[model samples]
Each structure stands twice: as C-alpha cells, then as structure tokens.
Target: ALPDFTSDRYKDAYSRINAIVIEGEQEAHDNYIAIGTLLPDHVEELKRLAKMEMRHKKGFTACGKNLGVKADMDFAREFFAPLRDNFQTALGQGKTPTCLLIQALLIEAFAISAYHTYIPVSDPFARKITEGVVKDEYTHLNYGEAWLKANLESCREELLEANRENLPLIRRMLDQVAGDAAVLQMDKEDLIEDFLIAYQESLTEIGFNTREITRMAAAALV
Candidate 1:
C-alpha cells in the first residue's frame, strides 16, 4: 500500500523489514527483563508475553535463515545489545513503571502494525505466519491493556497530578534507541501514529484508559 512491490524499494524494504523484525524481538526480550523486575503483578502475563515474543523472534529468525541471512539468537540479541545496559540503568535508578509500560504500549502497538504490514505486502507463507502471530498479539494486547488499566486505577489522583513528570523521561528512553528502528524503515511519525492507533484500539477492546494505564505502569516500576 505504501509503495509498489515491483520497485526495488519494496524488495529493499522487505529486507529491511526482516532485519527490523530481528531487532524488534531482541528489543522486546530485553524489555521483558524490565517488566519482570518492575511489574511483579504482571509477571505471569509478562512471561507468557515474552514467550510469545520469542515465538515471533524464532519465526522471523527462521525466515531470515531460509532467505540466506545469518539469523540466530546471537544475531537477534545483537540488535538490542545495548538495551540490557539501559534497562539496568533505568531499573537500578527506579524508573517509573508508567515510563516502562508507556514504552511497552508503544512497542506492543508497533508489533501489531508490523505484523499487519505483512497482509498486503509479504509472500503468502510469510503473510500467513505473520497474520497468525498478529492474532496472538491481539490476545496479548487485551491482556496488557487490562493489566495496565487495573494498575493505573489503583492510583487515579496521583497519576493525574504527576502525569507530565514521567512522559518526557520515557520518551527519552525510546529516543535512546534511535537508530535501532532502521528495521521498520518508516519515518518515526508514521511508526508512532500507527502504534498509537493500535494502542488505542487495544485499550478500547480491553476497557483501559490512558490515565489508568500509566498508573499501572507506575505500579510496575515500584
């Protein structure tokens, strides 16, 4: 839809998308460690989500291997190689769960969009696999949105007063991995817009709000 597949750009874009998928999974794996640390309440859910992410990672890794790209856990881990340090820094210093979950929500949003990209663009088998993965994420999104809402609902007023306090910091965290997004190839604007759309839809389905979501995120941090 964004571009004609007959063009070299589409082929190149596909290659980039594969690479991005690899990096995206690694980034998620790295972030799960944080969720495990910051959000005890969601640990079981997070572990299940992380397993799902790994399922995605392995699927894409095999896709790369079939295409003659050197794909492996090592290669996947290399993409977000720096995330470990940054995650540690954030956790050690007591970054807000709101900050972490906001970022997670963003990541989850991207995951949904990334898979959706396959429908119109990818080869049939790849498209099928991605579509299946996307369906799994749809379920995961509901769980995440519900978890976020419950966490936030517990501290409604404080979150309203302290909302701006955490936004910039989390945004900054996302920025820290700036070049890390080359896998998607879309401008940050498009990427973020799609993510927001995905997140809002997910929230609505799960009956969560931005306010309650952030509070749950903050609770996870503690």
Candidate 2:
C-alpha cells in the first residue's frame, strides 16, 4: 500500500525515525568539534561544519512539527548509544583518525545515502529541507576523505580496526529502522545499497584501491 501519512502508525514511525536523524545531526555537530580538537589547522573549517549540523537538526525537527509528530528522542538516543560510546572512546584515546572515520566518513555517508532515499518519499517541505541537506553532507564526506587520504599511511590500520568495530553497528541500526522506513515508502535494501555505494566511493576518494575497499566493506557483515 502507498504511504498514508496521516495514519497513526505512519506518524509513530515518523516520530522515531525523525528523532533518530535529529539525534544523528547533533552527534555530527559534536563529533566535528571533537575532530577540531585534534586538527587545530582545520578548527574553523570544522566549526563551520558543526554549525551546518545544528542547522540541519533544526530543519529536521521542523519537518516533524509540520507532520504533527513529536519526535521520540529517547528511542533515538538509545539507537545512537553504541556509536557514541565508540566515538567517545576514540576521542579519549586521542585516536583522531578513527574518530574522524566514525563521524566524518561513516556517519556522514549513511546520512547522505539515507537522504537520497528520503527525498522522494518526503512531504514537500521535508523534501526541500532534505535536498539542501544532502548537498551539504557531501562536503562533510569530502573533509574526512581528504584528511584521511593525506594521513592514510599512518591511520590505515586504525581505520581498518575502527571499521571492523563500527560498520556492523551501522548495519544493525539500519535493519532496526527498516520497519519504520517502509511506512514512508523507503526500503531497507535501498538504504543499505545506497549507503554502501556512497560508503565505498568515499573510501576510493580516500585512495583505497578496489581490493581494499571491497575488504573494508566486508567488515559490515561481520
């Protein structure tokens, strides 16, 4: 059946997913600030990135209001807990490279890909908010790609380890949200497929060859 946006089921699903993305944007903002702590040279640049995240957060929150849904932020917070714990662990250890990989590459890529899936199914106002946001996300993706590319030799191993630990979490997270996604005319596989495409391209942009990119992505399954 086509999405019935006014249905209670749909609204409940929207509430949770909307909260999830809103939380994700806030996480992105804080992670960028943490990234700034490590790369002093890029502090101002990353600050700008952080600012964009808060703006996106507000936009998404507004999208919820327009739908007459109050976001289920508690559920969203729990959804993001493991990733945040992993991120905080990396930051505490001064593992800036892995931290950047977590927020900049991993988080941003999923958001970008999900936004692509989201736009067509979104309500008009929400679609407008998303379309503009999706473009800004690429810039976020590029920052990590560039930074990681320049420092790849040093962080390659850490990046691999981080991906091994984190990618499965993302996979599970997506699966958990798939049911809610269906209410919006979005498919879980579309989210996963597009995410992998965007994910691998970012890896390639960071200078991984085909074989390495393949293997790195394989980490998501196990």
Candidate 3:
C-alpha cells in the first residue's frame, strides 16, 4: 500500500524521527569536539565537522517546523543517553580510538544511511536539506575511516570490543523506530540493509578481514 504521509502514524513517527535527527546532530557536534581533545593534532579538523553538525541540526529543526511537527525531544534524549554514557566513559578513560569509532564508524555511517533512505520520501524542503547533509556525513565518515584505517593495528581490539557493546543498541533502537519510519516510506528492511552495507563497508575500509567483519556484523542481531 502507498504511504499515507498525512496520517497520524506518520506524524507521530515523524515527530520522533525528526527529534532523533536533531538531537543526534547536536550530539555529534558535541562529540566531535570532545573527541578532538583526545586527538589534539586534529582539533581544528574535528571542530569543522562539529560546526557542520550544528548546521545540520539547524536544518533538521527547520524541517520539523515546516512539517508542523514538534519533535519528541524527551524520547530522543532517552534513546541517546546510553550511547552518550558509553562515549563519556571512553572519553574519560582517554580511549581515543573507541571514541572516534563510535562517532565515525557507527554514528556517521548510520546518519549517512538513514539520510539517504529518508531523502527520497522526504518533503521537497527536507529532501534538499538532507541531500546536502548526506554529502557532509560522507566527509565525516571518510574522516573516521581514514583515522581508523591508519591506526587499526593499535586500536583493533578496542574497536572490536566497542562494537560488541554498542552495535546491539543501534539494532534495537532502529527496530523501535521502524514502524514510524515505515509510515514515511522508509522500510525497515531497507534501513537495516543500508545500515549493514554502510557499516561493514566502513569496517572493510578500516582493514577488517572478512571474518572479523562478519563477526562484528553479527553483534547487531541480538
């Protein structure tokens, strides 16, 4: 059946999904700067990415307003709390790679996948903003991939361990929002597939062998 873009299901779902995007971008801005502290040499580079995230957040906020959607900020915050805690722990411990992996490998990749999935179905205004946003996310993803690819030998175990703990959250989080996404024509199956493709693609570029990639991918299942 064709999606009912004006239906309550779509509105309610859009509220949360919109909230997630806004909140997520803001977090990424905050996160990139924080990660910059650990990688002192790249502070300027990371700062630039963080500013882009701030702009993305503003754009998405505008998108939600255009739709008359007041995003469910509370739910979005709850959704992110755990991940933020993990990031904070990594930051406190001075685990640079762990922090970077979370943002670049997982967060940015997921944003790229989700934004790509969302663009076609998005209203014209949002589609335009998201298109630009997707381009920026690729830059973030590339930065992450380059950093990890260069330091894989030193951070391999940390990346693996971090994935083990964090991948499950993304899986469950996606499922929780799946119904809402479907209301706007973003299929659960496609979101999952796109995420895995992007996720593993990053891992591959970061020099994970096939078996390790496959193993880490499984962490999302349960």
Candidate 4:
C-alpha cells in the first residue's frame, strides 16, 4: 500500500507515464525484431536485452495499477508516433542496425535519464519500479554503445548524418513530455539538461563528437 499522490497534475502524470510504459515496451519489441532481422549475428545478445524491456514495461504498468490508474495505451501510441514513424522509415531504407543503435542510444537513453530524474519526485513504491527499470535501460545502452563502437568505421558517415537529423526530432519528443514532467514536480530545464547530458555522453562514447549536435538540440529549447 502507498499514499495517494493523486491530484489533477498527478493524474496527468499517470496518463503520460502509462503511455510511456506501453510505448516503451513496443519500442523494445521493435528493436528486437529489427536487430534480429538485420544483424542476425547479434540477435542472441539483443534477445537478452529485449527481454529486459518487456520486464520494464510490466513493472511500469504495475506502478500505475498500484497507484490505481489504468493507462491510456492509445495516448501512448500517439505520443510515440513520431519515433515509430522515423524508425520505420529508416528501417525500410535498409538502415536496420543504425536504427537499432539510435533507439538504444537515443531513445532508451532518454528513458533512462527521464526515469532517473523522475524517481525523486515519484512515490516510494513507484520509485522502486523506476530504479529497477533504469538499471535495465543502462544495460540496453551499453549493448548499443558497444555495437556502435564495433561497427563505427563502417557506419561513421551514416551515423553522423543520422544523429544530426535525429537531434531536432529528439528535442521535439522531449518537449511533448516536458509539461507532464513539470506537473509531476520536475524542474523542466534540469530534466532537459539531464537528457542532453546522457545524449551527448552516450553518443561520444559510441564514437562521435555530439558537440555541434548538442548545440543544435539545445537551440530548439530556446
């Protein structure tokens, strides 16, 4: 049992968080399928990674249920429309591995950072759920980063171009969730900064100087 934190704003947060969990699971499923088909060799490892995503989704939904809220899956689907569309478009163009890397590095990375920031304001029970998922997300990121590094030379140009193009889209996606996060008692700018930091750090570790892309992404906020 947990204390009720329900308010108008808290309800809003519930909706958004619910959607994120549903979409997060789907994203993970898509990643597994995409990686399995395109990079068969790495499918086994990705299978293990993808399993954690499903686990995260389950935990997230449990959080909502524990809080006595039913998630709006439709809203979550709409929220992720842009990311889903973009990734599919890239996948169709035969950029499968690149797409996976982007989702893992950019998408999962954002989720991790968001959850990290979110935990402090979340209920203690919900915080435990988030903490567990955050660790799993970190594992996903590590695999993505390692894969990117292994194939860096072959995909260097494409990866840079992809990151540049994706930054603005990423910024827009963050903007969508910012209001809900603020309602849940987050410092908007600080959350954004946390995301940006993770974004740049992960990209840099995966072998790109995200310096300019970082500037561009931040410019969108202003």
Q: Which has the greatest lDDT?
A: 2
- CA RMSD per model (angstroms): 6.4, 1.0, 1.3, 2.8
TM-score of 1: 0.62
| Clash number for each model | 7, 0, 0, 0
* Candidate 1 lDDT by residue in tens digits, 1-222: 334444444444455456667777756765665667767776887787778788887888766555454433443345444434545555676554443444455456667765664455455556666877887766656665666566665644533433344434334434443343433334455445565577557555545567755553453242
lDDT of 2 at 154: 91
Q: On a 0 to 1 TM-score scale, where does candidate 4 land against the true structure?
A: 0.89
lDDT of each: 0.56, 0.92, 0.89, 0.75
Q: lDDT winner between 2 and 4, please give it.
A: 2
| TM-score result, candidate 2 | 0.98
What is candidate 2's CA lDDT for residue 69?
99
> TM-score for every candidate vs. truth?
0.62, 0.98, 0.96, 0.89
Misplaced by over 4 Å in model 4 are 1-4, 210-222
The number of clashing residue pairs in model 3 is 0
Per-residue lDDT of candidate 3, residues 77-161 (tens digit): 9989888889999999999888887888788877888998888788888889999899899899899999999999999999999
Tens digit per residue, CA lDDT, model 4, 126-181: 89888888877877788778888788888877776666667566687777877777
Highest TM-score: which candidate? 2
How far residue 90's Cα lies from its native spot in candidate 1, in Å, is: 3.7
Lowest lDDT 10-residue stretch of candidate 2: 1-10
